[PDB]
Amino acid sequence: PKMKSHSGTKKRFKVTGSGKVTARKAGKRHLNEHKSSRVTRRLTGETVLSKGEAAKVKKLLAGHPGR
Amino acid sequence: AGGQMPIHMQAPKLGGFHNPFRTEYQVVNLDKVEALFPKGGKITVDDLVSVGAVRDNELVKVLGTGELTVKVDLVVDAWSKSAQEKIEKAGGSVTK
RNA sequence: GUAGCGAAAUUCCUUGUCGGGUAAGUUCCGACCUGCACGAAUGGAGUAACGAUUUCCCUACUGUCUCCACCAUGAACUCGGUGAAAUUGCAUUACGAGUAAAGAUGCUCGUUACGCGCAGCAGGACGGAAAGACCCCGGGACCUUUACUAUAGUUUGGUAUUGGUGAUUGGGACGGUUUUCUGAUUGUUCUGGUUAUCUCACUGUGGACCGUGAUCCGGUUCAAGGACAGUGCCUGAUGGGUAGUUUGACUGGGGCGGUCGCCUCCUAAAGGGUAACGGAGGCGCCCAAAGGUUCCCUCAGCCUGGUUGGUAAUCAGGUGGUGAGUGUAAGUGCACAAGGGGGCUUGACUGUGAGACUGACAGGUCGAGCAGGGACGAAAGUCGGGACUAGUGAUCUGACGGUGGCUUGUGGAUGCGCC
RNA sequence: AAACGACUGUUUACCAAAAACACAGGUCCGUGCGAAGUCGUAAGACGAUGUAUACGGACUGACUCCUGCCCGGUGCUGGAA
RNA sequence: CCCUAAACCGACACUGGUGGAUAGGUAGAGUAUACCGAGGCGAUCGAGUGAAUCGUGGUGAAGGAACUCGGCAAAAUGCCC
RNA sequence: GGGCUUAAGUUAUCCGCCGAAGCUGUGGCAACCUGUGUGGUUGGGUAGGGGAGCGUCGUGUCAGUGGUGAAGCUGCCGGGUGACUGUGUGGUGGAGUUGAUGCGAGUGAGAAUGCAGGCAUGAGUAGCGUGUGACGGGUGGGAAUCCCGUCCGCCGAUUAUCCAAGGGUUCCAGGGUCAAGUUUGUCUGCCCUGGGUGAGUCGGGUCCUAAGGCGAGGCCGACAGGCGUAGUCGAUGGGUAAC
RNA sequence: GUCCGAACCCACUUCAGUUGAAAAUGGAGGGGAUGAGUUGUGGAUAGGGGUGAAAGGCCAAUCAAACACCGUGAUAGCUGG
RNA sequence: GGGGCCUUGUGGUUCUGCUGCCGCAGGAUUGGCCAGUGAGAAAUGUUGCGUGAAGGUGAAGCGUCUGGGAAGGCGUACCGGAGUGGGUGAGAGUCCUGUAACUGUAAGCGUGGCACUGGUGUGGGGUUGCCCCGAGUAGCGUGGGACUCGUGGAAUUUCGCGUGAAUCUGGCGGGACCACCCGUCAAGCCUAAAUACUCCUUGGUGACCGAUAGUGGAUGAGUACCGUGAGGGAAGGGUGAAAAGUACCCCGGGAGGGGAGUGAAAGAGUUCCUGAAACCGGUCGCAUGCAAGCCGUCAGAGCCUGUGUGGUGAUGGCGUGCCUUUUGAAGAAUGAGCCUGCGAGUUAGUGAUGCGUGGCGAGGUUAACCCGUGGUGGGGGAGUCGUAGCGAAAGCGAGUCCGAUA
RNA sequence: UGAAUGUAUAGGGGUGUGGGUGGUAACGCGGGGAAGUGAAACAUCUUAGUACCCGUAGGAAGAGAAAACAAGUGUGAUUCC
Ligand SMILES: CON(C)Cc1ccc(O)c2c1C[C@H]1C[C@H]3[C@H](N(C)C)C(O)=C(C(N)=O)C(=O)[C@@]3(O)C(O)=C1C2=O
Ligand SMILES: [Mg+2]
Ligand SMILES: [Mg+2]
Ligand SMILES: [Mg+2]
Ligand SMILES: [Mg+2]
Ligand SMILES: [Mg+2]
Ligand SMILES: [Mg+2]
Ligand SMILES: [Mg+2]
Ligand SMILES: [Mg+2]
Ligand SMILES: [Mg+2]
Ligand SMILES: [Mg+2]
Ligand SMILES: [Mg+2]
Ligand SMILES: [Mg+2]
Ligand SMILES: [Mg+2]
Ligand SMILES: [Mg+2]
Ligand SMILES: [Mg+2]
Ligand SMILES: [Mg+2]
Ligand SMILES: [Mg+2]
Ligand SMILES: [Mg+2]
Ligand SMILES: [Mg+2]
Ligand SMILES: [Mg+2]
Ligand SMILES: [Mg+2]
Ligand SMILES: [Mg+2]
Ligand SMILES: [Mg+2]
Ligand SMILES: [Mg+2]
Ligand SMILES: [Mg+2]
Ligand SMILES: [Mg+2]
Ligand SMILES: [Mg+2]
Ligand SMILES: [Mg+2]
Ligand SMILES: [Mg+2]
Ligand SMILES: [Mg+2]
Ligand SMILES: [Mg+2]
Ligand SMILES: [Mg+2]
Ligand SMILES: [Mg+2]
Ligand SMILES: [Mg+2]
Ligand SMILES: [Mg+2]
Ligand SMILES: [Mg+2]
Ligand SMILES: [Mg+2]
Ligand SMILES: [Mg+2]
Ligand SMILES: [Mg+2]
Ligand SMILES: [Mg+2]
Ligand SMILES: [Mg+2]
Ligand SMILES: [Mg+2]
Ligand SMILES: [Mg+2]
Ligand SMILES: [Mg+2]
Ligand SMILES: [Mg+2]
Ligand SMILES: [Mg+2]
Ligand SMILES: [Mg+2]
Ligand SMILES: [Mg+2]
Ligand SMILES: [Mg+2]
Ligand SMILES: [Mg+2]
Ligand SMILES: [Mg+2]
Ligand SMILES: [Mg+2]
Ligand SMILES: [Mg+2]
Ligand SMILES: [Mg+2]
Ligand SMILES: [Mg+2]
Ligand SMILES: [Mg+2]
Ligand SMILES: [Mg+2]
Ligand SMILES: [Mg+2]
Ligand SMILES: [Mg+2]
Ligand SMILES: [Mg+2]
Ligand SMILES: [Mg+2]
Ligand SMILES: [Mg+2]
Ligand SMILES: [Mg+2]
Ligand SMILES: [Mg+2]
Ligand SMILES: [Mg+2]
Ligand SMILES: [Mg+2]
Ligand SMILES: [Mg+2]
Ligand SMILES: [Mg+2]
Ligand SMILES: [Mg+2]
Ligand SMILES: [Mg+2]
Ligand SMILES: [Mg+2]
Ligand SMILES: [Mg+2]
Ligand SMILES: [Mg+2]
Ligand SMILES: [Mg+2]
Ligand SMILES: [Mg+2]
Ligand SMILES: [Mg+2]
Ligand SMILES: [Mg+2]
Ligand SMILES: [Mg+2]
Ligand SMILES: [Mg+2]
Ligand SMILES: [Mg+2]
Ligand SMILES: [Mg+2]
Ligand SMILES: [Mg+2]
Ligand SMILES: [Mg+2]
Ligand SMILES: [Mg+2]
Ligand SMILES: [Mg+2]
Ligand SMILES: [Mg+2]
Ligand SMILES: [Mg+2]
Ligand SMILES: [Mg+2]
Ligand SMILES: [Mg+2]
Ligand SMILES: [Mg+2]
Ligand SMILES: [Mg+2]
Ligand SMILES: [Mg+2]
Ligand SMILES: [Mg+2]
Ligand SMILES: [Mg+2]
Ligand SMILES: [Mg+2]
Ligand SMILES: [Mg+2]
Ligand SMILES: [Mg+2]
Ligand SMILES: [Mg+2]
Ligand SMILES: [Mg+2]
Ligand SMILES: [Mg+2]
Ligand SMILES: [Mg+2]
Ligand SMILES: [Mg+2]
Ligand SMILES: [Mg+2]
Ligand SMILES: [Mg+2]
Ligand SMILES: [Mg+2]
Ligand SMILES: [Mg+2]
Ligand SMILES: [Mg+2]
Ligand SMILES: [Mg+2]
Ligand SMILES: [Mg+2]
Ligand SMILES: [Mg+2]
Ligand SMILES: [Mg+2]
Ligand SMILES: [Mg+2]
Ligand SMILES: [Mg+2]
Ligand SMILES: [Mg+2]
Ligand SMILES: [Mg+2]
Ligand SMILES: [Mg+2]
Ligand SMILES: [Mg+2]
Ligand SMILES: [Mg+2]
Ligand SMILES: [Mg+2]
Ligand SMILES: [Mg+2]
Ligand SMILES: [Mg+2]
Ligand SMILES: [Mg+2]
Ligand SMILES: [Mg+2]
Ligand SMILES: [Mg+2]
Ligand SMILES: [Mg+2]
Ligand SMILES: [Mg+2]
Ligand SMILES: [Mg+2]
Ligand SMILES: [Mg+2]
Ligand SMILES: [Mg+2]
Ligand SMILES: [Mg+2]
Ligand SMILES: [Mg+2]
Ligand SMILES: [Mg+2]
Ligand SMILES: [Mg+2]
Ligand SMILES: [Mg+2]
Ligand SMILES: [Mg+2]
Ligand SMILES: [Mg+2]
Ligand SMILES: [Mg+2]
Ligand SMILES: [Mg+2]
Ligand SMILES: [Mg+2]
Ligand SMILES: [Mg+2]
Ligand SMILES: [Mg+2]
Ligand SMILES: [Mg+2]
Ligand SMILES: [Mg+2]
Ligand SMILES: [Mg+2]
Ligand SMILES: [Mg+2]
Ligand SMILES: [Mg+2]
Ligand SMILES: [Mg+2]
Ligand SMILES: [Mg+2]
Ligand SMILES: [Mg+2]
Ligand SMILES: [Mg+2]
Ligand SMILES: [Mg+2]
Ligand SMILES: [Mg+2]
Ligand SMILES: [Mg+2]
Ligand SMILES: [Mg+2]
Ligand SMILES: [Mg+2]
Ligand SMILES: [Mg+2]
Ligand SMILES: [Mg+2]
Ligand SMILES: [Mg+2]
Ligand SMILES: [Mg+2]
Ligand SMILES: [Mg+2]
Ligand SMILES: [Mg+2]
Ligand SMILES: [Mg+2]
Ligand SMILES: [Mg+2]
Ligand SMILES: [Mg+2]
């Protein structure tokens, strides 16, 4: 049978043109008042995963190209 | 992950949405057009770019990375501004 | 906490104390009350009779014993027949003092010992039998309850079954008395609450009759109820009656106690890092100034003089470099002040981030330069909160504001996305 | 002679026969009969071919003398501004 | 045909369990017990041998619970008038 | 440990030797690096990673081979760095199977208190299930254990006799001694063959009902089903004619 | 629901057995033995249920939820191989 | 849309009543386009085909050699629309059974199809004025279920309980809802084929098993046996080509053996092919009764043998099992009495992701299915991956996104 | 024929007209409907509408001739791949 892809991984991770795995930075959904604009700038970007985490995400995606 | 909140839970969900009616433009470049129609392709068409390679039964947008030293009449579905500018500079045209 | 009872089937201390019994009595039985922690239908205190119940004593009686002996028998033992069992890494399987996974037939150093049988005894082979029944850890089961979430049942009201006619009580329709109105209303319709009636709805019932010569059942009828009850659906309450489950870890075993994230110091062995239920403390804030900027100032202590006034309030002179101070722990800092004061302000900005620091990662931290638009300063310039480092919470889901990217035939709407 | 249970009985087949259970007696609560209670989805049935001197539940446990104070908590019963 | 069993229930040709009927004599209250009757059996490995020891019985000087957690077991008592 | 001071004790110092799978010499194997004439470095190893193989079975193809003896089994003589092996040589055996090269695996066992069978160990050991047998004669290949007889002992509210339940041919006669019988056995409740059970009255049915079961219709229940009327069964009882 | 005591029913003590004669018995005593007695035959109650003079006892020789089959090759961060 | 209202049209008529002495309908052998045993508003005899169940025919070899036996060897011929097998005393194309090919089928309830018989039967155009078009239904509320959708922005669909419509200028659907547009006409019914399956029947097949395997079952197998019952549930295959199964004699009561016969073989004698290991013995060689032994190993005398290598081994040195699990085990931690057999990394996906290798290459590749009853081959490009990325997306595009066209 | 009873029905008496009963390996349709398991606990969810169960077929069944899709043209019953 076909292998299903992981739903959370589908919704959370992207794969770039060069095979890099990127996610959205965590920690900016709420409780933003005490955070400086510098902290929000650090948390508003797009993070590139480490090699091990990227391999795990690629295993979780059943060939799904990411969101 | 051993009980630690796993990456696929700690990372925030990329939100957004998908366009239900999004169409994807098969793209051909001026490098490829020049290479596959070197003898000054007079009137290239969707069928001609398909017999070369455009993956037919799709819209056949033409993009403009290249030089296009020849004169060519593209007759395709949509084109980029730089591609159009290069085409009229070389002396060709686009249609549709 | 009464009557009564009490070192008791209850008394920890405890062999309480006294008295009886014995030559000697932690037991006994009668008392004391100092009841750790009696007590009146989970009955209190008694009680003739009863007890293969528990306890103490006397007598009789005895191999229970001093202290065993002897006799006969079924096994044991020899011969003939028949003929298992658990167990089993191995074998030509000593002792001593050692050594080693800390208890050796098997290793070391020594000592002793001819080969093989038979009857015996149980010190060892950590002997055999049962993947310890205690302990802990994982799982399960059943039990309990004011654990959680449900549920049968019981119960509430609505509504359907469900109709007829009334009164007695509230809200309008509605005009046309009042006085559209603070206040009164009536009639003409409409709609709630409450309540009493009526009866080929219904009740599964009391009598009679018939199916039938049947204590079932049904039908007819009478009586009694009666739109109630019953039942369906919806709904609130109740519900260990029942069901599924949860009930953390660390830990010099576990339990109890304590602890769990963040910050500072020491341990920490002069980079960084470094554990213990190691040694000390803090944090879950605060401040519209205690932020920004610009200019100005120097403290604490000590000595002397001085109304109230004293060690110490305010004042003067002298001395005094950090020992004062710092919103808040501690350290590193800060007198060039980052400490004290005045002026003007909102940078406690928007768009950014070269380049680095630090973590397994999520992440945490610093940051030049630039644009916009400001504050302060004559300018140089400084300003993306606070001398620095704690004052915090990923994701999910939902919410508000803005934006308008998307919207399933189109236009809206609605929903979503983005910030 | 003391403790316990009044007694005869009953009980852990296969480690406990007892001071445990039962018991006669006692009290409280429920039940007006299609009873309450119980089995069952229901019809039915037991209760009972019984009718409050009965039936069901609870605790106590022959007999003698007795059974005190507390309704704040919880439960039950009644009441409904 | 077996049938208070070698034939049934116990895996056995198993010192266990299995309902009913008949059931004489003497001693005796007796269907207890002893020895016998009607009738039936000698039991399904034997032969020996004074070992220790274990089981099962027997007797015991003087003492008489000194035993032991405890008079456990045994002994004594026992019937009729 | 023996023993040692007459050091074989301590200490300073000198001269020798012993001593490892270390080093060196010699011979073989292997991995890697290197310019590729040389040479250099390396080769303990659990978990584990990489590489290259042995053996078994099936199978495509080619070459074959086999009663002048395949497979299997079992000796001897050999071979390889290993799993293993000989195209050496016998024995047993009686119908298949070898080499090359591919292909496919139910492809390798010493452990799982593993499963099945066979067989050891304990061991000629414990036991042979309450007891009283003795003798004379007989039978027989064989007799404590079979038959007959005589003594003796045992049971006798049962070790007797007859039923029910249950069993099912064990009953009788004759033949038998592999197995079974806790020994032996000529014997048997065993084996083999044949035979044996006679009812108007006995015990049941043809008669009766109890508890209880089933239950025409029926009532109840989503279905499945529950209950129950009329009935109809059901002895452990009633009724019923022989000694 | 008297007394002593056989049958009968029981199971208090002790010894033996404990690879037993026996997966609970045997020897010696012991309790009840006209009663809430005991026993034969047939029947009824069934597994979250039965029944229980109540021990969580018993329900076909292991019952804090029987047995058989099925879901099923349940699952096991554990032990073994 | 239909009914109605009309302008016409019914198969050529014997020539009946009614509507108007117009027309309508019954009528009757006869055409007849047709249509038929089907779901089709229906269902009743005679004639044309190859066959299934049984059968029939079915080609073509001898001679020598060794052997118990020829299918083997050697020589030499034949058949083949037949060389697929399986038998026969060993390995057969021509010995047997068959096979190829052809043929028969009477019969079937036969069956399928054809003819006939027989049985059954037209519309087109206009027209709104009217009439009809499936009701406790659709909807709505509520409590549940199914839809990717787990109550939600909740369409569509469904059950219980309430409530309850329009009906053509109408109803429903197009994911709340409304409008328009597009589609469609629910609340009546029947419908072959492609699809699923095998207790059975017939034929065939297997890099499937070969008696601990394969069914539990190659045999009295759901049997023996166990359980009250539901239920559980085995083990045991092989003489030889042919019984020619050992006449007769001897020891023995027999059992068993010894002679002899049968047979190629009897050490193939029925417990019978082959006959391994554990295990149990006889014989021979050496060692062993002064010795402390994880049982071996290295050194090594003597003896035996010499089939000149082998067997044995006095005596000396060194030396604490295997596995598991462990910081650490000879361990007095676990498991194993012994041998033989059996017993654990598999398989399936046009799964995911690497690598090796082969093909093709800016292209690669098919899936279902169709053809090949002749297979493993050919077709099939629907799809799918590569061919452009960036963005939540509109979109833009070698750029894009955040941003101010920074 | 017609009860109570008036209509009449229930019922009763004929007649025998037709059908039913039960079995069956898989496949079908309609309905009822687990748990172990997974989620490293667990309750939503999962397992799974699976196991099992009830009713009921046929040689196949079910479905089926648009109150359908589509999205601007169009497709034209259902089933299956
Ligand atoms: C007074 O402390 N002493 C030392 C203990 C002890 C003393 C005398 C005994 O007579 C028994 C015991 C222990 C228990 C253990 C029980 C246990 N069970 C209850 C879970 C168990 O696990 C088994 C078993 N079959 O494994 C049993 O044997 C068991 O039931 C039983 O019977 C026991 C006895 O007999
Ligand atoms: Mg947000
Ligand atoms: Mg902010
Ligand atoms: Mg956590
Ligand atoms: Mg005292
Ligand atoms: Mg005390
Ligand atoms: Mg005293
Ligand atoms: Mg009181
Ligand atoms: Mg009280
Ligand atoms: Mg008390
Ligand atoms: Mg009392
Ligand atoms: Mg008292
Ligand atoms: Mg008393
Ligand atoms: Mg007593
Ligand atoms: Mg005395
Ligand atoms: Mg003896
Ligand atoms: Mg002997
Ligand atoms: Mg030591
Ligand atoms: Mg020692
Ligand atoms: Mg030693
Ligand atoms: Mg040794
Ligand atoms: Mg000995
Ligand atoms: Mg001995
Ligand atoms: Mg010992
Ligand atoms: Mg032990
Ligand atoms: Mg254990
Ligand atoms: Mg246990
Ligand atoms: Mg034990
Ligand atoms: Mg639990
Ligand atoms: Mg249990
Ligand atoms: Mg109600
Ligand atoms: Mg109501
Ligand atoms: Mg009234
Ligand atoms: Mg009335
Ligand atoms: Mg009235
Ligand atoms: Mg409870
Ligand atoms: Mg509970
Ligand atoms: Mg669970
Ligand atoms: Mg835990
Ligand atoms: Mg813990
Ligand atoms: Mg502790
Ligand atoms: Mg440091
Ligand atoms: Mg350091
Ligand atoms: Mg550390
Ligand atoms: Mg300052
Ligand atoms: Mg702020
Ligand atoms: Mg940077
Ligand atoms: Mg920090
Ligand atoms: Mg600026
Ligand atoms: Mg200025
Ligand atoms: Mg500050
Ligand atoms: Mg400041
Ligand atoms: Mg979550
Ligand atoms: Mg659409
Ligand atoms: Mg922003
Ligand atoms: Mg007293
Ligand atoms: Mg006392
Ligand atoms: Mg008593
Ligand atoms: Mg009493
Ligand atoms: Mg008594
Ligand atoms: Mg009893
Ligand atoms: Mg007992
Ligand atoms: Mg009473
Ligand atoms: Mg009632
Ligand atoms: Mg009654
Ligand atoms: Mg009491
Ligand atoms: Mg009060
Ligand atoms: Mg009170
Ligand atoms: Mg109240
Ligand atoms: Mg008898
Ligand atoms: Mg017997
Ligand atoms: Mg028997
Ligand atoms: Mg007399
Ligand atoms: Mg007697
Ligand atoms: Mg006699
Ligand atoms: Mg007799
Ligand atoms: Mg016997
Ligand atoms: Mg002797
Ligand atoms: Mg005596
Ligand atoms: Mg004497
Ligand atoms: Mg004496
Ligand atoms: Mg005397
Ligand atoms: Mg005396
Ligand atoms: Mg004493
Ligand atoms: Mg003493
Ligand atoms: Mg005594
Ligand atoms: Mg006595
Ligand atoms: Mg050396
Ligand atoms: Mg070396
Ligand atoms: Mg060397
Ligand atoms: Mg190596
Ligand atoms: Mg080395
Ligand atoms: Mg390894
Ligand atoms: Mg040959
Ligand atoms: Mg072979
Ligand atoms: Mg090969
Ligand atoms: Mg294998
Ligand atoms: Mg093996
Ligand atoms: Mg075995
Ligand atoms: Mg032996
Ligand atoms: Mg002997
Ligand atoms: Mg022995
Ligand atoms: Mg012996
Ligand atoms: Mg003996
Ligand atoms: Mg005897
Ligand atoms: Mg005898
Ligand atoms: Mg005799
Ligand atoms: Mg006698
Ligand atoms: Mg007598
Ligand atoms: Mg008979
Ligand atoms: Mg016979
Ligand atoms: Mg027999
Ligand atoms: Mg006989
Ligand atoms: Mg014998
Ligand atoms: Mg005989
Ligand atoms: Mg005989
Ligand atoms: Mg009769
Ligand atoms: Mg009856
Ligand atoms: Mg019926
Ligand atoms: Mg009768
Ligand atoms: Mg009868
Ligand atoms: Mg009495
Ligand atoms: Mg009896
Ligand atoms: Mg006892
Ligand atoms: Mg004992
Ligand atoms: Mg008495
Ligand atoms: Mg019964
Ligand atoms: Mg208890
Ligand atoms: Mg039992
Ligand atoms: Mg349970
Ligand atoms: Mg499952
Ligand atoms: Mg498992
Ligand atoms: Mg273990
Ligand atoms: Mg022929
Ligand atoms: Mg030939
Ligand atoms: Mg319609
Ligand atoms: Mg709708
Ligand atoms: Mg709804
Ligand atoms: Mg759903
Ligand atoms: Mg709806
Ligand atoms: Mg729409
Ligand atoms: Mg249909
Ligand atoms: Mg088999
Ligand atoms: Mg074999
Ligand atoms: Mg076999
Ligand atoms: Mg049976
Ligand atoms: Mg031959
Ligand atoms: Mg042979
Ligand atoms: Mg054999
Ligand atoms: Mg053989
Ligand atoms: Mg010697
Ligand atoms: Mg030694
Ligand atoms: Mg350890
Ligand atoms: Mg060991
Ligand atoms: Mg050992
Ligand atoms: Mg262990
Ligand atoms: Mg072992
Ligand atoms: Mg083994
Ligand atoms: Mg395409
Ligand atoms: Mg049928
Ligand atoms: Mg669950
Ligand atoms: Mg779970
Ligand atoms: Mg788990
Ligand atoms: Mg159909
Ligand atoms: Mg059509």
Side-chain angles (χ1 to χ4, degrees):
Chain A
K2 292 198 287 203
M3 182 179 72
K4 312 201 178 173
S5 51
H6 201 252
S7 292
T9 315
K10 293 191 293 184
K11 291 153 186 191
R12 275 158 181 97
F13 297 103
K14 279 197 307 201
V15 184
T16 67
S18 79
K20 295 184 200 177
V21 178
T22 81
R24 179 188 261 247
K25 290 290 288 197
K28 213 189 65 154
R29 288 282 205 242
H30 69 120
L31 297 154
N32 291 323
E33 175 289 342
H34 75 93
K35 312 204 199 108
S36 178
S37 296
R38 292 180 291 113
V39 176
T40 300
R41 200 148 38 242
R42 286 199 291 265
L43 303 170
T44 187
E46 199 86 20
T47 176
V48 170
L49 266 65
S50 163
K51 44 154 77 173
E53 271 69 41
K56 184 156 280 197
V57 159
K58 276 177 180 173
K59 267 166 208 173
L60 287 171
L61 305 153
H64 195 280
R67 190 257 171 267
Chain B
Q4 157 163 309
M5 182 81 36
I7 53 153
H8 57 89
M9 306 213 168
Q10 260 178 353
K13 266 208 284 177
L14 316 160
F17 65 102
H18 294 116
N19 188 12
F21 310 124
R22 174 176 168 74
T23 190
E24 298 265 341
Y25 265 118
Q26 292 289 152
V27 290
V28 70
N29 278 306
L30 291 195
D31 291 331
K32 179 154 276 193
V33 168
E34 217 176 329
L36 282 71
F37 299 88
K39 201 58 65 69
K42 179 86 165 187
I43 188 170
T44 312
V45 297
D46 274 13
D47 291 331
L48 294 174
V49 295
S50 158
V51 304
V54 70
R55 188 197 268 199
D56 78 13
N57 296 115
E58 294 293 328
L59 309 172
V60 173
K61 194 183 201 149
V62 57
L63 305 176
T65 187
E67 294 294 328
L68 183 63
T69 61
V70 298
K71 152 181 167 168
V72 63
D73 291 331
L74 277 296
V75 193
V76 285
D77 292 326
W79 50 87
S80 67
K81 296 183 290 294
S82 66
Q84 184 178 2
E85 175 280 358
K86 290 183 180 180
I87 297 169
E88 282 96 14
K89 184 178 184 293
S93 68
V94 288
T95 302
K96 291 174 70 175

